[PDB]
Write a protein that binds this ligand. Sequence first.
Ligand SMILES: Cc1c(Cn2c(=O)c(C(=O)O)cn(-c3ccc(N4CCNC4=O)cc3)c2=O)cccc1C(F)(F)F
Ligand SMILES: *[C@@H]1O[C@H](CO)[C@@H](O[C@@H]2O[C@H](CO)[C@@H](O)[C@H](O)[C@H]2NC(C)=O)[C@H](O)[C@H]1NC(C)=O
Ligand SMILES: *[C@@H]1O[C@H](CO)[C@@H](O)[C@H](O)[C@H]1NC(C)=O
Ligand SMILES: [Zn+2]
Length: 215
Amino acid sequence: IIGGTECKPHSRPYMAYLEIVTSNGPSKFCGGFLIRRNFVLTAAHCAGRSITVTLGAHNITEEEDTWQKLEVIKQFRHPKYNTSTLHHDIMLLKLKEKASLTLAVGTLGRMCRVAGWGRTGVLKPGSDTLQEVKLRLMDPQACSHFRDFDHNLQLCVGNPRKTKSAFKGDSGGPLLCAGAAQGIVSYGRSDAKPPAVFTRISHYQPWINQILQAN
Ligand SMILES: Cc1c(Cn2c(=O)c(C(=O)O)cn(-c3ccc(N4CCNC4=O)cc3)c2=O)cccc1C(F)(F)F
Ligand SMILES: *[C@@H]1O[C@H](CO)[C@@H](O[C@@H]2O[C@H](CO)[C@@H](O)[C@H](O)[C@H]2NC(C)=O)[C@H](O)[C@H]1NC(C)=O
Ligand SMILES: *[C@@H]1O[C@H](CO)[C@@H](O)[C@H](O)[C@H]1NC(C)=O
Ligand SMILES: [Zn+2]
């Protein structure tokens, strides 16, 4: 998160920290969010050989009793997810156990908020602490320069005149508008120049409910 503020600890108890494992490279990291006790929503580009979800985190380097490190038993990438275009960049993670409900862990032109543990700058390292930034929802034409952006599939997010932006490692986290998740952090420019592309959750609601009722 670039240009944001450290969240009040555990003020966003649905936030998930994903440690993704690959067979040929080191750990990667994404965000996500708990929508059911045993289901986390994230971006499909965050898929890997195996994922661990940490719920209840603020400072992700200091283990605390709020933490719930939960095994993921299966990854549900959108069946139409495309690695070239990043269309349908959405994925459900089924947790091994149902998470405990705690004060720190629970389920979930307008301005919206996005939170994450990603880098605070292009050449800055990932954040120790969960950070949040307020971003503007833009008309689709502001994301035209992303040639594979599509208004029905995706939100365009972030005033280009500001440096405020999600960035590397914030992938998969929710964009919340007036209290409700509307978007999932997907992609943007290597120079962190806003705006960025977010998955439009509403388009995928039928698909989400199909997976949830089948598992
Ligand atoms: C994740 C993030 C990034 C990260 N990011 C890069 O850092 C980076 C680079 O070259 O380093 C490239 N991409 C990137 C850009 C474009 C693609 N697309 C476009 C269509 N198909 C592609 O392959 C893929 C990846 C990033 O998302 C940048 C700005 C904001 C944000 C976020 F807002 F989404 F959080
Ligand atoms: C998050 O937790 C880590 C680890 O406990 C903190 O790291 C310390 O940072 C200070 C400087 O701020 C160093 O001088 C210490 O040596 C570090 N301690 C350890 C044990 O690593 C970090 O500051 C915390 N960040 C927060 C709360 O924002
Ligand atoms: C992804 O998108 C490209 C370009 O739009 C298309 O030609 C290709 O069939 C797709 N590939 C996969 C594997 O989904
Ligand atoms: Zn705590």
